[PDB]
Design a protein around this ligand. Structure first.
Ligand SMILES: N#C[C@H]1C[C@@H](Oc2ccc(S(=O)(=O)C(F)(F)F)c3c2CC(F)(F)[C@H]3O)C1
Lengths: 109, 110
């Protein structure tokens, strides 16, 4: 089984939740290629039962600026849902993007 | 435009431990040419101390965003103004030493 560091990866989102960048590491964890994620909303990936909570978590992020998602399912490329927890950090410049540190709770390997 | 920027990760001393390939367009180096070296090595001598003090402080700021502006030496031999925004992450399931996550953008000094 993979340790914590090996189950942690970065993603970056525009304010509408679209992927603008993702670590290569997502591929061994959740199957997606970063290339295929660019331009797609994070929201297209959430289990419907966690959907409500992710919307509130988002709204909280936009007003606080940093927020911990708490536990949620994300649909994996090749079927089934994986448990994650995410820390979100908004980057404002002179809001420019959101930095997500994602940790996969599910057992991997 | 769509201003250019790249993510890097650093240990608390400043060493690049991860670099996103968007660094090629921004500062001209390949990731492998950055990995393993300290960010302070690419920094203008008037800004090195500011950058070292910024690394030191970002760990005291409890995962909060810290921003710094400095001159970074590109592979094209130019001093680029870089705004680096950084924050620490430590997985709360662990007691591993935190590390430092950065986003780096070429900005205007004016
Ligand atoms: N890989 C991957 C992921 C898609 C998933 O994206 C988020 C997870 C939690 C969240 S969140 O809102 O719960 C958090 F940012 F606070 F963690 C968010 C996102 C995208 C976002 F826009 F940055 C943000 O909505 C992480």
């Amino acid at each position: 089984f993979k340790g914590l560091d090996s189950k942690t990866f970065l993603s970056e989102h525009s304010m509408d939740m679209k992927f603008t960048y993702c670590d290569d590491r997502i591929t061994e964890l959740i199957g997606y290629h970063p290339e295929e994620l660019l331009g797609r909303s994070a929201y297209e990936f959430y289990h419907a039962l966690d959907s409500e909570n992710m919307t509130k978590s988002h709204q909280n992020l936009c007003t606080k600026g940093q927020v911990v998602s708490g536990q949620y399912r994300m649909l994996a490329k090749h079927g089934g849902y994986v448990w994650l927890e995410t820390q979100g950090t908004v980057i404002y410049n002179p809001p420019q993007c959101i930095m997500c540190v994602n940790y996969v709770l599910s057992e991997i390997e | 435009c769509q201003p250019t920027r790249f993510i890097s990760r650093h240990n608390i001393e400043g060493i690049f431990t991860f670099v996103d390939h968007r660094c090629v367009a921004t500062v001209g180096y390949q990731p492998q040419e950055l990995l393993g070296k300290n960010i302070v090595e690419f920094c203008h001598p008037e800004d090195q101390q500011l950058l070292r003090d910024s690394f030191q402080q970002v760990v005291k700021l409890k995962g909060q965003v810290l921003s710094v502006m400095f001159r970074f030496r590109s592979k094209n031999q130019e001093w680029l103004w870089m705004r680096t925004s950084s924050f620490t992450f430590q997985n709360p399931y662990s007691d591993e030493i935190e590390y430092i996550i950065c986003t780096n953008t070429n900005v205007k000094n004016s």
